[PDB]
A paper describes a structure:
The bacteriophage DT57C is closely related to the paradigmal T5 phage, though it recognizes a different receptor (BtuB) and features highly divergent lateral tail fibers (LTF). We present a composite map determined by electron cryo-microscopy (cryo-EM) at resolutions ranging between 2.9 Å to 4.9 Å of the entire T5-like phage particle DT57C, and atomic models comprising its core structural proteins. Our results provide a complete atomic structure of a T5-like phage, provide insights into the process of DNA ejection as well as a structural basis for the design of engineered phages and future mechanistic studies.
Furthermore, we could separate the particle population into pre-ejection (capsid filled with DNA) and post-ejection (empty capsid after DNA release) states and to reconstruct the related states of the portal complex and the tail tip individually at resolutions sufficient to build atomic models of each state, gaining insight into the conformational changes leading to DNA release. Using 2D classification, we identified a smaller population of phages (~20% of all particles), where their DNA had been ejected. Following a similar methodology as for the intact phages (representing the pre-ejection state), we obtained reconstructions of the different parts of these empty phages (corresponding to the post-ejection state). Consistent with structures of the closely related T5 phage, the T = 13 icosahedral capsid of mature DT57C was composed of two proteins, the major capsid protein (MCP) and the head decorating protein (DCP), and it had a diameter of 930 nm. The asymmetric unit comprises 13 copies of the MCP lacking the Δ-domain (the first 160 N-terminal residues, which is cleaved during the maturation process of the capsid). To further confirm that empty phages indeed correspond to a post-ejection state where both the DNA and the bulk of the TMP had been properly ejected through the tail, we compared tomograms of virions in three different states: empty virions with an intact capsid, filled virions with an intact capsid and empty virions with a broken capsid. The tomograms revealed that nearly all empty virions have an intact capsid.
Residue numbers in the entry:
A (entry chain D): 162 to 204
B (entry chain E): 205 to 457
C (entry chain F): 307 to 457
D (entry chain F): 205 to 255
Amino acid sequence: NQSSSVEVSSESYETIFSQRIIRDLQKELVVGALFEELPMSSK
Amino acid sequence: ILTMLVEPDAGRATWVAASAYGSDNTTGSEVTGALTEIHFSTYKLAAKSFITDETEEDAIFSLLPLLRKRLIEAHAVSIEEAFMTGDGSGKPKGLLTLASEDSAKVTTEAKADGSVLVTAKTISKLRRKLGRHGLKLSKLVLIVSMDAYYDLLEDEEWQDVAQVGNDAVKLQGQVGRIYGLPVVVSEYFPAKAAGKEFAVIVYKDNFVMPRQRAVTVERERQAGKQRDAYYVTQRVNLQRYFENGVVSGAYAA
Amino acid sequence: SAKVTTEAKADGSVLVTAKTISKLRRKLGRHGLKLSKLVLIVSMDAYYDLLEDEEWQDVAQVGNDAVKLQGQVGRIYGLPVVVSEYFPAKAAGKEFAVIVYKDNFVMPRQRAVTVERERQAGKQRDAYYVTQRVNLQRYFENGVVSGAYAA
Amino acid sequence: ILTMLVEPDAGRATWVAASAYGSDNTTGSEVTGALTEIHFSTYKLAAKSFI
């Protein structure tokens, strides 16, 4: 703050650090899993 | 200040060749990631008014409730105006300023003089610049100026009943949903002129209101001048998470 | 300065159409956003011109209330129509319709309509006197818009 | 004559800088207002006849 007669040393004592983690809207996946499986047990 | 963490982007795998089965290249490549952060702040809004202890007697009716109500309503007017189009110098950056500085100011062909009106198709064309967030309709807010609303009321594409269902203008005189977007009229838009915004669409969930203290009223008695000072202060700001979620249309240059 | 000079001519080259009437609501400003608190008044010639309006002819255009099926015009753009015959004569620059903010107007009055009779025996006459004191005033300086024929 | 009163319009506040967080500018500006009045009157209309 640095305006009173008594203030704090560094901004890290004026700040609240949060572990909350956020992400934006992400693209969707469509053609990844629309076809049907074909299991091969050989080469 | 308050800080939150933003998770990084995505990574890619690799297609290993068939000749690398007997070497360490079989296992592929590396995927690295680094976090980031953002911060929020606040701004202070203040106003005051004085009432000498002799004008109270020097009148037939009281004048205090008028003073207090004027204080509160002035405070609300200023905060809403600043949220509309406040700059960044000591005041929150207004929605229109955010849209302009994000290059989301779509310059339409409507004219400020009045040669060309504002059509509903033009309003709906702004949804493109929203990008990925424009696909969903329940998460959007539409706000139009007064003159935009009056030009909407005279749209050739909404007159006939056969053109637009039962909500034809000729039968109602009012316009409700435009292209599925509800219509809200606000009068705090800038003055009507060339290159000025007349409608804005925002992603509602992207914006937050950091706030430290609410509106507080303090009363001080100044016996040295025989007055009754009143003080009203608050600390708010308008902040958003990411750099997207707003689009604004403007008249032609 | 709410007299809107529209395009309808004073002879009959251009008629008076529903769009001209509905466009006046803009000049009402903030008051024009609520239809339930307005009144529209049109003259004889304006009403007869509306009866021939091109945009109220067909069933497809305007619901079931096309002119061809009824022959009279009721609600227009949501505004009920009232016909009055006391407008000035159809001439260049004169008016043919008016929209008023109803609640903005009051009619002050000091005394009702009173009748007094006097007997003048010197002339064998009975004089009858009818008097009243009224006026028409508004609260604030707005709420009325009128459209006029072209110059 | 009958006279009524008219309330004034709205004011606005100010955003103070952080540099003035301790001085006397931390309260910003002042909002003021004055009232107004209107008037009403009447006119007289009359008619007469004899028989």
